[PDB]
Amino acid sequence: GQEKLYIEKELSWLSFNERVLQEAADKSNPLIERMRFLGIYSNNLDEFYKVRFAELKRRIIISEEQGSNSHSRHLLGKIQSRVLKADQEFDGLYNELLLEMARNQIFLINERQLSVNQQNWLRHYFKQYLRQHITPILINPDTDLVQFLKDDYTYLAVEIIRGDTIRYALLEIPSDKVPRFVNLPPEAPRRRKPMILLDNILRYCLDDIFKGFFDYDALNAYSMKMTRDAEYDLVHEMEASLMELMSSSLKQRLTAEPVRFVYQRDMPNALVEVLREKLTISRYDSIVPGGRYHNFKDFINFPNVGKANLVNKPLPRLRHIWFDKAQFRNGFDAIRERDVLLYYPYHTFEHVLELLRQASFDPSVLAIKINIYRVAKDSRIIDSMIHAAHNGKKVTVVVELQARFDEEANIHWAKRLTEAGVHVIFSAPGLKIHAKLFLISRKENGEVVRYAHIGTGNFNEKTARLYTDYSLLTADARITNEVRRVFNFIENPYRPVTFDYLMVSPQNSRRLLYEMVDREIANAQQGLPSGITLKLNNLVDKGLVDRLYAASSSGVPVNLLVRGMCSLIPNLEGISDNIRAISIVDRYLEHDRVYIFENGGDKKVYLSSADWMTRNIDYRIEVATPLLDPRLKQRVLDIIDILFSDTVKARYIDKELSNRYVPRGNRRKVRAQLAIYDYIKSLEQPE
Amino acid sequence: GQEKLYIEKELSWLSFNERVLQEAADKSNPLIERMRFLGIYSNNLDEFYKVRFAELKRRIIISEEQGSNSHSRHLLGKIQSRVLKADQEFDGLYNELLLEMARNQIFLINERQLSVNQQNWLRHYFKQYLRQHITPILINPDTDLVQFLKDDYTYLAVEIIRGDTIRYALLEIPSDKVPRFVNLPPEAPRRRKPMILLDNILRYCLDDIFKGFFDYDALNAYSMKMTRDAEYDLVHEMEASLMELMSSSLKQRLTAEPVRFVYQRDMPNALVEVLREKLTISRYDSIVPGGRYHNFKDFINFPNVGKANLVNKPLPRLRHIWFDKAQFRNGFDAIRERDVLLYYPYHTFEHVLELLRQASFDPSVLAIKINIYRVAKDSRIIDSMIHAAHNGKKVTVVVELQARFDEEANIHWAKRLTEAGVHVIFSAPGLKIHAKLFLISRKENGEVVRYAHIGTGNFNEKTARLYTDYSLLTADARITNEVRRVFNFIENPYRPVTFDYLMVSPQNSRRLLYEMVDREIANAQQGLPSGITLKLNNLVDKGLVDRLYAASSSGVPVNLLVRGMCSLIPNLEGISDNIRAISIVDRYLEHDRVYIFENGGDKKVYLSSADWMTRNIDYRIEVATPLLDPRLKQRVLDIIDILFSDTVKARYIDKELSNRYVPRGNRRKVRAQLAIYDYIKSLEQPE
Numbered sequence A, B: 001g002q003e004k005l006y007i008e009k010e011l012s013w014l015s016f017n018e019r020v021l022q023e024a025a026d027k028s029n030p031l032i033e034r035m036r037f038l039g040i041y042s043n044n045l046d047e048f049y050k051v052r053f054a055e056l057k058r059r060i061i062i063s064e065e066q067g068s069n070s071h072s073r074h075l076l077g078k079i080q081s082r083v084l085k086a087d088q089e090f091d092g093l094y095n096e097l098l099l100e101m102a103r104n105q106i107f108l109i110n111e112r113q114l115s116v117n118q119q120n121w122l123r124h125y126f127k128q129y130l131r132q133h134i135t136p137i138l139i140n141p142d143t144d145l146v147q148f149l150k151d152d153y154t155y156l157a158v159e160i161i162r163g164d165t166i167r168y169a170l171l172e173i174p175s176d177k178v179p180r181f182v183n184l185p186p187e188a189p190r191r192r193k194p195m196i197l198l199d200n201i202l203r204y205c206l207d208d209i210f211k212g213f214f215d216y217d218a219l220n221a222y223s224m225k226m227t228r229d230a231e232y233d234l235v236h237e238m239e240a241s242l243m244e245l246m247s248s249s250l251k252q253r254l255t256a257e258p259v260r261f262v263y264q265r266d267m268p269n270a271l272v273e274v275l276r277e278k279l280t281i282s283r284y285d286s287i288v289p290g291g292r293y294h295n296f297k298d299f300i301n302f303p304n305v306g307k308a309n310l311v312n313k314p315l316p317r318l319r320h321i322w323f324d325k326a327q328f329r330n331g332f333d334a335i336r337e338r339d340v341l342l343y344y345p346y347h348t349f350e351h352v353l354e355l356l357r358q359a360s361f362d363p364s365v366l367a368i369k370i371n372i373y374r375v376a377k378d379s380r381i382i383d384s385m386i387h388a389a390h391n392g393k394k395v396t397v398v399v400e401l402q403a404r405f406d407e408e409a410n411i412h413w414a415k416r417l418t419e420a421g422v423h424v425i426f427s428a429p430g431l432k433i434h435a436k437l438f439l440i441s442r443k444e445n446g447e448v449v450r451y452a453h454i455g456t457g458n459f460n461e462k463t464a465r466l467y468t469d470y471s472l473l474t475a476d477a478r479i480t481n482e483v484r485r486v487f488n489f490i491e492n493p494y495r496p497v498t499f500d501y502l503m504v505s506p507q508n509s510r511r512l513l514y515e516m517v518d519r520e521i522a523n524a525q526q527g528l529p530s531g532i533t534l535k536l537n538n539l540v541d542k543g544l545v546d547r548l549y550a551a552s553s554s555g556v557p558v559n560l561l562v563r564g565m566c567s568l569i570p571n572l573e574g575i576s577d578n579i580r581a582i583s584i585v586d587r588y589l590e591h592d593r594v595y596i597f598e599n600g601g602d603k604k605v606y607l608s609s610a611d612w613m614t615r616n617i618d619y620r621i622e623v624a625t626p627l628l629d630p631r632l633k634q635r636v637l638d639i640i641d642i643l644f645s646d647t648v649k650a651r652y653i654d655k656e657l658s659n660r661y662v663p664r665g666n667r668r669k670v671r672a673q674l675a676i677y678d679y680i681k682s683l684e685q686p687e
């Protein structure tokens, strides 16, 4: 490299979480929301290590085996670099936010700031409510924390000192059975709202915990947390020519998931060594010193002690009034009349759940097929699908038990399904089914009419309230038939197949996209209006970035709204002069995906479940649908228009990863998500 | 039979639940508590059928196989008789209580009593909150409710009528995911507190449920509930000479657990027949018509809408102040100083949980053995026992995975135990370990000192708050050593063993009891003061009743406080003239067991885990402990004195099963449980 043509996805990912941090620092956001963003940021980083980092550790491992020509370390250095720098800023924001809460009458204090009154209250509050959950785990020579030590739990490693004697015990912070934030009794004025972290309650009560059975001069506590790399799965979804000739010293070296362990900085070396030996911290395991408190991701649920000002005002999920028209007797009548497009969370996910429920008992419904990637806990969907089975409908449920986190859950989401009579199909070993689909076939006076749902986000009830996603509900046969083929394709991928409307990975994708970029390229070179506008969560695929580069260089206007990782570098003289790249991080996690191609003037609009990452094009089943109803197409365009006109949360993507905000010229101050909500609200007003 | 010498246990059991009904009718009790007693009564009856009745159905089955000489039917008739008569009174009380609630401004109404305003509210409240849980289960020819139809759940069988056409669907009352009582909006005055049963919400909204996909002239709903006889286990705990030569047509005829099914009376016959065929209602299955509402056991949790008057005033579980004396540094020091007796729920079960927790980490504790019959959900005890294992203590946990209801739970209460390093021991096939014990062995400057707990009730956290039970905590070696033998006995029952203090079923029991009754018998006949006073939950064993009869007839004063089944008939001229039998049913479920023998004047007092039923003497491991510390002995006697002086809740036991209340002469009006609470409160006052 001499002038980086692409950006490392990992670094770009860090730039993204950094954008999340910006929300915690954005004074325009409600105080407690900012505090909660510290939680999202942390949680994101945790996920980052468990997965993306772990994935990288293995990519370099595979590489080095026979020898790697890439500068792996130069990456890890940057990563570790940017991470520490952000960590510095995190503390700055944290302390800054603590102070601002103090000005708001909210005081988060520790055991060293207790009133000689609140201490008494805590000691009492501790016996009555916490002691029962706190049981000292004595670390002896034959004790092996290794096994029974909970993952990602924070432990207070205590140092029992008696003369020159030192014993060690562990205290599990029971964040599962008790609020991580206890409210203390206001010392003097009633102006107060003092709270304390559960960890610090234990620090203050250490004596009360051990005096009962131990003799000692002093008791010292040091926090610690253990983590484990994610099960090697995402890395074998790429080994083609590598794993067809892979060595057996690379299989035991690639599957060996290491263990991480962070501990409070002051932890005396002796203890750190004790813990090391107990946790078999080998060469590829990591020990990292990092502060008093861990699991900052609990702040995601930081309580709002003060007034409503400290929290965002709810944006009530709207009903798509169309479904409630008296003329329609049920979901189907509404969908058969006109295609329906819902944009969450602006809209309720309620409509889809209703339809599936209706589908489970409508006597005229013959079959239901549906994709389950990551569903909510005890999905109402799983429920309906089982009810449907009981009612005799033929129910097929494709389950991606090989998801990312909500995976072990989609395995039990099977014993009952099959037991009820649901024909289940599973994801082939290293090929995920990420498409968000479901197909309902019902009899309408003799004929079999199909209704299909193609979405950008999964069938997850909570998610549907934090993530922006589109849901297409249609009865249009051009699309309905193809969605039927996707399911048959999934059941029998041996039989050749072709799609004329739908983009289907890994059958259609690349060819179909290259084809569309190339078409804009041709038009531009012929002086015809052109353009490529993409709304994705990640843009990393080599062949596609190069294609977009080719488009810019060819005179094609490329507009990108990527919220996550973007390896494409915009504005490189003579390479991406015509590419404008922005990212929007706000209250709702932007998750929907759209592809817009000028197409000489007859705009093509696709909603997709696939980001522009190699895995989404060649190693997974994904689905993008064009929008055939010009009314919906326009609706999406309006929404896109709003997004690209954002001048409050929009950030530019540049090679410096600066995360500079988009300056608003003399153009309207616009906040996409809010304006979009107005727009959708605007559509749901009484006919 | 010509003059019944004994009473059928089952009939006596019905007399007992009848005593529970009396509490629902006792105007001296708070209105809502009375309503809740209707719940306990119902729940008791449900348990009665699933177990005791089922047990009886099999006892007659075994009998008739080769031929039975007993008058089985004359029993079933009485049972079915008394049951229906009580049912009549139930409705009387119910309606009576509905009216009294009306006078208290609480109105429980049905769909036929809605204001043309509240209806609107319900329809709306239904879409927004219930529809999602209510999914019509269409009953078609190939549908088989049999399988997926939930046990003990109430179903609204709906009749879809279109012309002379009739379809059927089932509606599951989702009492699990929604309050069974919804509050309605007060029609006019603000005096109201109108509520409605969830079942009736569905009755009112039937139309809203089906209009979407069904054409019909009328919709009719009829409630139904399905139940299943308890797994044949309690009956094979008695087949000795019978099952050593038992036939294989008696094994398939004894293990075949039938199915019960109650339905609303008006259920049109056609439907009743439909359901029959669907549920394979054979010859030994039962179909019973019985009212609009089922699962009256939900009233156990009937909400208190009005003022505190409608509910009992809490009797705060007291701390045994002795444990909190500054002189003691922990539980052990307290127990080594003096034996400790706790009487729940007057006392907290908290002390026992504390000790076990302390035991789990006290470095000087070497081992912990404990009995688990029926523990609370996610027992803190199971937890401590696992922590103890982690800390290296040798933990043995005898688990009676063959309990009555909390059984399938004591099976999972194993995978983690053993995984943590706990040596588990299970209950031999048809021999339950009902003893309430635990043994802690800890080092006290060189020597191994043992602490033991012998209780009358099990280690159940909730139970400890509704049941009266004693807990003996001692370090007295005379008792501590024997409790050690009990556990070794349980692990290796092949080695012969003897007990000099403890009564241990089925090794000591009968011989030990007969011995004590016979001793009182001897004394009386010699003009020496004598007496037998028993506090049990059931008295049914033939040999023991006959023994008590022998005692009365011999001039021995026999005082019995039996709360449940009592087959002994008191006051039979020339048979039980000296036996006074009473039963106390009140707010706390009397559950403790004590045996008092005058013994010439040097009173012997035993606390036991065994009732006087055959199963508790010869077919189960049970334990009774004498009280060696005269101070505790006296404490129990005082409590017994109080119990037998009750003149508010005490009921006489007679052959007519009249449940007549004990008249108070000019003797103090006394309510045991309240006076006992005062007495215990009286003991816990600052030294």
Ligand SMILES: Nc1ncnc2c1ncn2[C@@H]1O[C@H](COP(=O)(O)OP(=O)(O)OP(=O)(O)O)[C@@H](O)[C@H]1O
Pocket (backbone or CB within 6 Å): A020, A040, A044, A404, A457, A458, A463, A466, A537, A585, A586, A587, A588, A589, A590, A591
């Ligand atoms: N601004 C934000 N709002 C909500 N969650 C956010 C935000 N920034 C980061 N996150 C977190 O990042 C995680 C999400 O994204 P990803 O895009 O990896 O999700 P998925 O839900 O796994 O979708 P897909 O399966 O289609 O990749 C979220 O689940 C969320 O907790």
Ligand SMILES: Nc1ncnc2c1ncn2[C@@H]1O[C@H](COP(=O)(O)OP(=O)(O)OP(=O)(O)O)[C@@H](O)[C@H]1O
Pocket (backbone or CB within 6 Å): B020, B040, B044, B047, B373, B374, B404, B434, B466, B537, B585, B586, B587, B588, B589, B591
């Ligand atoms: N007044 C009451 N209050 C609470 N529960 C009651 C009452 N009357 C009857 N019961 C019920 O009847 C059932 C049982 O009593 P038993 O005396 O068989 O209980 P256990 O606590 O299971 O003891 P054992 O181990 O000897 O079987 C209980 O499980 C209880 O829920």
Ligand SMILES: [Mg+2]
Pocket (backbone or CB within 6 Å): A537
């Ligand atoms: Mg993703």
Ligand SMILES: [Mg+2]
Pocket (backbone or CB within 6 Å): A564
């Ligand atoms: Mg992602």
Ligand SMILES: [Mg+2]
Pocket (backbone or CB within 6 Å): B404
């Ligand atoms: Mg029992």
Ligand SMILES: [Mg+2]
Pocket (backbone or CB within 6 Å): B404
């Ligand atoms: Mg029982």
